[PDB]
Design a protein around this ligand. Sequence first.
Ligand SMILES: N[C@@H](Cc1c[nH]c[nH+]1)C(=O)O
Ligand SMILES: N[C@@H](Cc1c[nH]c[nH+]1)C(=O)O
Ligand code: NI
Length: 465
Amino acid sequence: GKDLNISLPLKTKSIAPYETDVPVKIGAAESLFKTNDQGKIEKALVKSYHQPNDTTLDIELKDNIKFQNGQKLTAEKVKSSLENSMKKSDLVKYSLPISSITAKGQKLTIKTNSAYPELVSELANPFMAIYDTDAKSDVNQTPVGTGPYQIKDYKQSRKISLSNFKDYWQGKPKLDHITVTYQEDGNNRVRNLESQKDDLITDVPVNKVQDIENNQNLKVSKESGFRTSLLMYNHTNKKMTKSVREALDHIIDRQGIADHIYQGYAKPATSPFNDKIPYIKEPKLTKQNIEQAKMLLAKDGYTKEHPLKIKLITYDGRPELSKIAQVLQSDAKKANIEIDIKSVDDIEGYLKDRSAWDATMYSFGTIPRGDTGYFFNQAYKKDGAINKGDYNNSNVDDLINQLNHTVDVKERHNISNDIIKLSSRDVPNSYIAYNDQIVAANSKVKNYKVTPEGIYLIDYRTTIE
Ligand SMILES: N[C@@H](Cc1c[nH]c[nH+]1)C(=O)O
Ligand SMILES: N[C@@H](Cc1c[nH]c[nH+]1)C(=O)O
Ligand code: NI
């Protein structure tokens, strides 16, 4: 009828909004702020805000908003949501250095101990989406949000069932039901779309785009966006020396990968951040050099007779990652490295054991809200939530800490470029490609989001005709 089936990669365990951006993606939850289609930060649930000094954020909430269970969105509900999310999530906690929150009616006041200009931007983070902390259901299974579709049932790691929330504050949502199912294999997602088992899929493998394009019942949408694929190193393993990271950095053929593996739907990467961001000063592009890799590896004493052995993790959800792993393995052998590839079903869980891997294929949304600070804090500081390999360098830390309280934007740019320059010397990770997000749908599905932040998908205007 007007039911929509969606097939996504990257199965979840908990679907608490502070554990995953999936509730925001599928239309169940909303943050106080959002980014619009051009990537700029906008008030979402907020009616008005002010910053009377650099440690004070005053917010007035819209007055016409309910949770999906009929409860009013008040300042007190927002206070308990943010406080709960900070308590339960390191990601949220390290992005929001809030010292206190007071609330009355629709107004709340958020304080920090020192200036943190990125605070408003991080309140647009989907992990900071607002839910009813007093709801009498398990937030890990059926969180209650303000979004147009309420989560009604969750089969853990498999399927989410959602229903139209008819009192949604922006307008009557246009679908009756949404069913979301997880499928890690990109080729199966496409087969599900072609056979009409699903209506909307993300992370289309680049080698299926033409097949979908030729189908008049289907359509493909692409967006260059801000997602970067990389090779992430485990810095807790002593064999992963700077010589080893540099060697592997030179075994990668970024240009070749962008052309033949991404078939032109990507650009070769240097830093974490897409070079289409105007103020970023990218480091020099590393070009494949097998001899140099062999040389560097000799420094640590590796040879054809006694090669470096590397356990490399990969996963199917981002479909090109394992294709890259395959060519890395093949090329690395020429440089006296024996790579064992292990593909896993739950990448985030697997990487938690730092004794179980030396490097991993990976992908992250490195600049979702227009500022580089989020990435540096979560990926390059010890215990940052996406720092899977525990990279940390006190000199980089110092610049990051200075960035965090820097208000002048031109100065933020300069410090950010200094962090890029200094950290690149360490090769904390090898950034491979800035790669487009590709979404495909039945041609009857209208008004889903494919925008550069790579987070949103469903909103109250998404429909079926
Ligand atoms: N950050 C990685 C792994 C992941 C799993 N779930 C969410 N993220 C990616 O998005 O590909
Ligand atoms: N999967 C999203 C969100 C995320 C947070 N941590 C890991 N992943 C990304 O990689 O951009
Ligand atoms: Ni991710």
